[PDB]
Amino acid sequence: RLSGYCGSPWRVIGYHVVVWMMAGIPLLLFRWKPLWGVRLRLRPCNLAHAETLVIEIRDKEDSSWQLFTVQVLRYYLFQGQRYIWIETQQAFYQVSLLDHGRSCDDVHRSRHGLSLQDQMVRKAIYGPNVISIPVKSYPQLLVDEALNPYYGFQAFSIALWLADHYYWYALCIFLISSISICLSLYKTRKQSQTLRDMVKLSMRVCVCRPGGEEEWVDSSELVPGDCLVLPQEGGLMPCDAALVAGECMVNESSLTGESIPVLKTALPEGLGPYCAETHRRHTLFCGTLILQARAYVGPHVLAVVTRTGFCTAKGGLVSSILHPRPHSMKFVAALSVLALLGTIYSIFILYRNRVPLNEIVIRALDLVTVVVPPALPAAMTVCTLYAQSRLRRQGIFCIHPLRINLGGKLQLVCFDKTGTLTEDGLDVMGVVPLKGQAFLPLVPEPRRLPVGPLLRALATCHALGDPMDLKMVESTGWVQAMEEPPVPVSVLHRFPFSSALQRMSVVVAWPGATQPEAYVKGSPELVAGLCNPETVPTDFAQMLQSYTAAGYRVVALASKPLPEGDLSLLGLLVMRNLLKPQTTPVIQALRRTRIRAVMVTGDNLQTAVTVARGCGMVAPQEHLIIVHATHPERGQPASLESRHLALSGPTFGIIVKHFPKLLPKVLVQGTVFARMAPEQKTELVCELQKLQYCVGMCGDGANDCGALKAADVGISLSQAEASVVSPFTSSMASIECVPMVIREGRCSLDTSFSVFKYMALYSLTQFISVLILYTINTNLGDLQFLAIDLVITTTVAVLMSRTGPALVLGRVRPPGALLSVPVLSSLLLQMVLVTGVQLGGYFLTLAQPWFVPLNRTVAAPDNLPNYENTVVFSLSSFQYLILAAAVSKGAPFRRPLYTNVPFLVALALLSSVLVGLVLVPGLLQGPLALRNITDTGFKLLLLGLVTLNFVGAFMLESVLDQCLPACLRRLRPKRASKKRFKQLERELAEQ
Numbered sequence: 001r002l003s004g005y006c007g008s009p010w011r012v013i014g015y016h017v018v019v020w021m022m023a024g025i026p027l028l029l030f031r032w033k034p035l036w037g038v039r040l041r042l043r044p045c046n047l048a049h050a051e052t053l054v055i056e057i058r059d060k061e062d063s064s065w066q067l068f069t070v071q072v073l074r075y076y077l078f079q080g081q082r083y084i085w086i087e088t089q090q091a092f093y094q095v096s097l098l099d100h101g102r103s104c105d106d107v108h109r110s111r112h113g114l115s116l117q118d119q120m121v122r123k124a125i126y127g128p129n130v131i132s133i134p135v136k137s138y139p140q141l142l143v144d145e146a147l148n149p150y151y152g153f154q155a156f157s158i159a160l161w162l163a164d165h166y167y168w169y170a171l172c173i174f175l176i177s178s179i180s181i182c183l184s185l186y187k188t189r190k191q192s193q194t195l196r197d198m199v200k201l202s203m204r205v206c207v208c209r210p211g212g213e214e215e216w217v218d219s220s221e222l223v224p225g226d227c228l229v230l231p232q233e234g235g236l237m238p239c240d241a242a243l244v245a246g247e248c249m250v251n252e253s254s255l256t257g258e259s260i261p262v263l264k265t266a267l268p269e270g271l272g273p274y275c276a277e278t279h280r281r282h283t284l285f286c287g288t289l290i291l292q293a294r295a296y297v298g299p300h301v302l303a304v305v306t307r308t309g310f311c312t313a314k315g316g317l318v319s320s321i322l323h324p325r326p327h328s329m330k331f332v333a334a335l336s337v338l339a340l341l342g343t344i345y346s347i348f349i350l351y352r353n354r355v356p357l358n359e360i361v362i363r364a365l366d367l368v369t370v371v372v373p374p375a376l377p378a379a380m381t382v383c384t385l386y387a388q389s390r391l392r393r394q395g396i397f398c399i400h401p402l403r404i405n406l407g408g409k410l411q412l413v414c415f416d417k418t419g420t421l422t423e424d425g426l427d428v429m430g431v432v433p434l435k436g437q438a439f440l441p442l443v444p445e446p447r448r449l450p451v452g453p454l455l456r457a458l459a460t461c462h463a464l465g466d467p468m469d470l471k472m473v474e475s476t477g478w479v480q481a482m483e484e485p486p487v488p489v490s491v492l493h494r495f496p497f498s499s500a501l502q503r504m505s506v507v508v509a510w511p512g513a514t515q516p517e518a519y520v521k522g523s524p525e526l527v528a529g530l531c532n533p534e535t536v537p538t539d540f541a542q543m544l545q546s547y548t549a550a551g552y553r554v555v556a557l558a559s560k561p562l563p564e565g566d567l568s569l570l571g572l573l574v575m576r577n578l579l580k581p582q583t584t585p586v587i588q589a590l591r592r593t594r595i596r597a598v599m600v601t602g603d604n605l606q607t608a609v610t611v612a613r614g615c616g617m618v619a620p621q622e623h624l625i626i627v628h629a630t631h632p633e634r635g636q637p638a639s640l641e642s643r644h645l646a647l648s649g650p651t652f653g654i655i656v657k658h659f660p661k662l663l664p665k666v667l668v669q670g671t672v673f674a675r676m677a678p679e680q681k682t683e684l685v686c687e688l689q690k691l692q693y694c695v696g697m698c699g700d701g702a703n704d705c706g707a708l709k710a711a712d713v714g715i716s717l718s719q720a721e722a723s724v725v726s727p728f729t730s731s732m733a734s735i736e737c738v739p740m741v742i743r744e745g746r747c748s749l750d751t752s753f754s755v756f757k758y759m760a761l762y763s764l765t766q767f768i769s770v771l772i773l774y775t776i777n778t779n780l781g782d783l784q785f786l787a788i789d790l791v792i793t794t795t796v797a798v799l800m801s802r803t804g805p806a807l808v809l810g811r812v813r814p815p816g817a818l819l820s821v822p823v824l825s826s827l828l829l830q831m832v833l834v835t836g837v838q839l840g841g842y843f844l845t846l847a848q849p850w851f852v853p854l855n856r857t858v859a860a861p862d863n864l865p866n867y868e869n870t871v872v873f874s875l876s877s878f879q880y881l882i883l884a885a886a887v888s889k890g891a892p893f894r895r896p897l898y899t900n901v902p903f904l905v906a907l908a909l910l911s912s913v914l915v916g917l918v919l920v921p922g923l924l925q926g927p928l929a930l931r932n933i934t935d936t937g938f939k940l941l942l943l944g945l946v947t948l949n950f951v952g953a954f955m956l957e958s959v960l961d962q963c964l965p966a967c968l969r970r971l972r973p974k975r976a977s978k979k980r981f982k983q984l985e986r987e988l989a990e991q
């Protein structure tokens, strides 16, 4: 990204502090884009060699960052990256490796150990080795989360309610909002604390010094440029190191996800630039568990430190998941302009009828805050809490309830090979060559088939920690081994595996009758070449190349009778990933429901294609895409095994380096991505989300943490340090946890849409009720308002979010747009219908024989009792339940409506109490302050009107649920939009 920086330290000491303390009042609105507020007070225009306040200018992007420059040499912090100031270059440069300017291999040989000098300046420039996690206090979280326009409007509404006699419900809303705020702050603080505890590390390391002395200091004192000694026993790697002498076996499961040894060699050649990307076979990354180290020269291994902190992607992952981590804004705006037209119309009415003498600033703001209800967040959050409780009862832990509503529009789910789809360990089923005479290739054979020396070798050759040895001993049927049933065999000594010899030997000296034999295990080529004088090989390389192309691990065994010079091949041992039987139905249902599923793995491409073919991801065909090389003047060949594509690490890098061309095609048609780095996975997730894709990552290891956090939703299995930010977390390791989560998300989205529609209808009908009441010049009592807002709103919010998800996955996803055509059309029709039926009763009772008419001279809260106010209250209380029953759904993708017994009995009790309060007076309208009319014919007509409005709302819902004019009249169709569908149609047309 192309961006600049500029500034100046101070203008002048003086009245500037008073200016700041007097202009910090509009800071609430100056929070977003504070560059204008900063330049309005403190912004000198002069030479810019020394700066303290740094501002960000918009050159290619649209952002605004505020940074502070500290003096130690001056530098500032920006997205976790240090930027020191160079006096010779007169410009800011990033603190990282010198590979950008000039690099070579001679300095890596000449940097063997550093003295006490030049260490403090390097520590001040590069910073500490530990990754400092920025923690914030409680007021910091308060100012960061709160003080948005929504909470400001809610506080204004609360103050307005406190100004009136609305104390009870106002303090109720205040206390529930406070509980929600404290809960969110506690959750955020716990997340920050566990993230800081996971990221931080402290252990003793050995640092070499010039002269021939070694000291043990803390890991924070490690600065790029010294020498690090790897322990022989192994341990956690706190910083990046480059091998200079000797070789070591290290586990790269923190970056790939496989617990296999990685071949790491030294650097015997020199005079070459250090790219740190193509030399992965020489240097090793940080955070890798050390298994075994060795060196042919020197008493200890020699390794030089090249980069620490936010350089070797360690802090890079955190800085990439923290800061740039990626229908809202039109419904509230449409309700605001609608309220503005309604609040000014009431002013003209009040100024003419009674002239309330400055009581209009209270009645108009009342309608303003009634149009926009404050109980919407609670009514939308109760459903998420119910869904989280249901998931926890099922066995799925959730930490963020706001992601449940977003989890209903999933269309792309990522699956990991190791851990998620398969197990972490390596299993075994038997030995394919039943004889040691180079048998012809065939299907693999199960266990228990060999017997005698072969069975003894397969059951005794083990270093028992190692999951493969455990699988072998549990599959061989022998558990000193009992139930042989011949005489048991005993071992005396075993040779530990090392890096110098790739063959593990095991000697046996049992006192049995026959001659004992020694069994070894290692690379197949070595034992095959060694056993040549004993037995001849026939079709030996074909089996190895087939197992390598099919993603199989080869293990050979040899035997030699004794009373490593001579050996005799007996059989070959193979390994599998043990594909779970429950994985196939899940992906089958996903492909049936038109839910795209891709595979993101860190191993080679051959194993990825093998797993995809075994599970059934690519049914029609499978295509592989590989690039010739990385240097310019390259090509894009086509290799053969809708259309699915397979990519690799460097392949995806070369594709993403060509962003302005053919990248959306690869993102749409490509489904297999092997050897993907954590940063590469995060970049792929970001690029996919840039195409309006609801990508959902699902993994258990620590390598895919960046992709799991950068995605919209993250499913975490096998609880570990990589499950502290991900909202979805399942206790079991089964793959069937995805369909239930998708169903719960769809149900929550449908319930949230229904709640939003009901709230909009309630707000609009209350608005028109207040309008007609101001036309009549009378106001309802505060007690009635409180009673309604409790026993209707809380009742529906508790008894409408209990509906469970559908039985099976739906064919079509629910609409995730609150401003669509049918949703708006049905809402407008219901609104005009309720407006036509509500004011009708007033016009009807105006013609009926009426007694003791009201006088429009007394104040609004003093004209009670009267007929108009009580009939308006009755009509509104009836229409509330009418709308609540009309917006109730759940047939397509949820539980049936008749299954909700509590909601049904609550609606029945509400209707009963309403008809009791309407028909018969006494003992029910005492504190309600009503006229207590005794007109039987009027009550019968009101019940008939309620019934006809009921059946009319039912007919309207039934005819609007067909959406026939929304589909049959779609000319022109929905083309020229939904870029995913456009790319799909372009791909199916051009191919």
Ligand code: ALF
Residues within 6 Å of the ligand: 256, 257, 258, 416, 417, 418, 419, 600, 601, 602, 603, 699, 701, 703, 704
């Ligand atoms: F364990 Al992986 F991609 F193979 F996270």
Ligand SMILES: [Mg+2]
Residues within 6 Å of the ligand: 257, 416, 417, 418, 419, 420, 699, 700, 701
């Ligand atoms: Mg994994």
